[PDB]
Structure formats: structure tokens, C-alpha cells
């Protein structure tokens, strides 16, 4: 959605942490030899802030973008089924192990389903 | 009382003017090649400004300073005096004229003081 990014600096925060942020962010970029501008806040196309919560400073970021998370996840589900992967919209309840190996997983169903490999990615659910 | 000045942009002002008076400065100062430079807000010494009127861009002017108003008017009594000027403690209240040149000037004790020279720089009193 799109290619580059705008940080943008203004006066409704903490000094501590903004202002030493945006310090940081500066380096980082110089560091890694990332291709970026300081830019006039006046050059920074659509907002329309607030005079008292308008930025002063800006930083034109190249290449750092953003994604549509819906797009991304429909494309991740159309580009793993193209690949052979089989979707079983249930959730796991226990996985299964014994002399330290991985033997499958019980769903929410009260289905067993076996496997040699278990990918634990539940979010916040992972270590539970 | 200061050979220097540092200009402040906060964002307690209408954008309108603040930032448009900020690049106007910086502009004038490099069209007169006058020394300056742009600061970081970090390195102003003394301020200790609440975070939410904070600046986030400085500029220091060298040699645009500041006198005490109180020891200059002292400074030019007694240089007045020195240099052979007389202090006369009243007001004018009237500057007498006729067939176009001035005669001198009625002060408010009643006194007349005669002259061929009257210079008014009585403030906003002038004019009237």
C-alpha cells in the first residue's frame, strides 16, 4: 500500500523520549547507509495537522513501507494451498510427545492428527 | 547584557506565521551572508521548557545581542551632560511657531524656552 515512510516529530510527548527517538532513528539510518532525508515538514504531502500538535521535523524513510494485512493473509492462504498445503480450520487443544520426540497434535474437535514436525505459530496462545 | 541571540520554533503559534517567520529569518541571514548557524534544540544552554511548548528547531545569530535599556538611558543622561547638554525636568506642552519657523517651546511650569532648533522625539506623544 505503500513504498515509503514519513516519521514525523512534533511537541505532544515527552522530550525523553520523542526527541532522543528521532535522534535515534537518524543514526540508525546513517549507520545501515539507508537511503533517507530529513525533509521540510511544508514538503509532506495530505496532513493537515493541528497547529499546536503540527510536526516541525520530518524524515522521508525509502523503501519502508506498509502492506494490507488482509490482502497479505488471503495471498499467504491462495500461495499455500497453490503449494500443496492442506488448511483444517480447528485449533489445537495438546500436542503429543513421548521419549522426547514430537508424535502430533489433538484438536478442538477430539481428532489426533500425527507428525514427525510440529510449528508452534498460536500468537499469544505459543507457550500455553 | 549578550553579543548573541537564538531564535526558537515551538509550536505554540499559528503555523501561518511561526513557520513561515522561521524560514524568512534563515533566509535573510543567508542572503547577508550574516554568521549563524542552525542548532540543535539540545545544545541551547539554560532553557528547561515543558515538553508539550518545547522547541524542536534552533538557529543562534552571532553578533545580535542585547543591552539593559535602564544602564543605556543612564549611560546617554550622563554622556548628554558630559558632552555639554543641560537636562531640563518638564514637559513641552506646546511648540511655538510663526511665519514657518519655530520660536521655541511653552513647557506645562508656564516657562517659555526660546529656539531655532526643536527636535520632538516625545514617543507616542508626537504626532498629537
Given at each position: 500500500?505503500?513504498?515509503?515512510?514519513?516519521?514525523?516529530?512534533?511537541?505532544?510527548?515527552?522530550?525523553?523520549?520523542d526527541d532522543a527517538n528521532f535522534a535515534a532513528v537518524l543514526t540508525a539510518l546513517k549507520e545501515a547507509n539507508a537511503p533517507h532525508e530529513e525533509i521540510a515538514v511544508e514538503?509532506?504531502?495530505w496532513i493537515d495537522p493541528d497547529p499546536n500538535s503540527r510536526p516541525?521535523?520530518?524524515l522521508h524513510i525509502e523503501g519502508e513501507g506498509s502492506v494490507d494485512s488482509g490482502i497479505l493473509l488471503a495471498a499467504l492462504e491462495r500461495s499455500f494451498l497453490?503449494?500443496?498445503?492442506?488448511?483444517?480450520?480447528?485449533?489445537?487443544?495438546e500436542i503429543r510427545a513421548?521419549?522426547?520426540r514430537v508424535e502430533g497434535v489433538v484438536t478442538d474437535d477430539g481428532d489426533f492428527l500425527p507428525a514427525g514436525h510440529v510449528v508452534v505459530a498460536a500468537g499469544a496462545r505459543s507457550q500455553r
Amino acid at each position: 500500500t505503500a513504498d515509503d515512510t514519513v516519521v514525523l516529530l512534533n511537541t505532544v510527548g515527552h522530550s525523553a523520549l520523542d526527541d532522543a527517538n528521532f535522534a535515534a532513528v537518524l543514526t540508525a539510518l546513517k549507520e545501515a547507509n539507508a537511503p533517507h532525508e530529513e525533509i521540510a515538514v511544508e514538503s509532506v504531502d495530505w496532513i493537515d495537522p493541528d497547529p499546536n500538535s503540527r510536526p516541525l521535523r520530518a524524515l522521508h524513510i525509502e523503501g519502508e513501507g506498509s502492506v494490507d494485512s488482509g490482502i497479505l493473509l488471503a495471498a499467504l492462504e491462495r500461495s499455500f494451498l497453490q503449494a500443496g498445503g492442506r488448511l483444517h480450520p480447528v485449533d489445537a487443544t495438546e500436542i503429543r510427545a513421548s521419549h522426547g520426540r514430537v508424535e502430533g497434535v489433538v484438536t478442538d474437535d477430539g481428532d489426533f492428527l500425527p507428525a514427525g514436525h510440529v510449528v508452534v505459530a498460536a500468537g499469544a496462545r505459543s507457550q500455553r
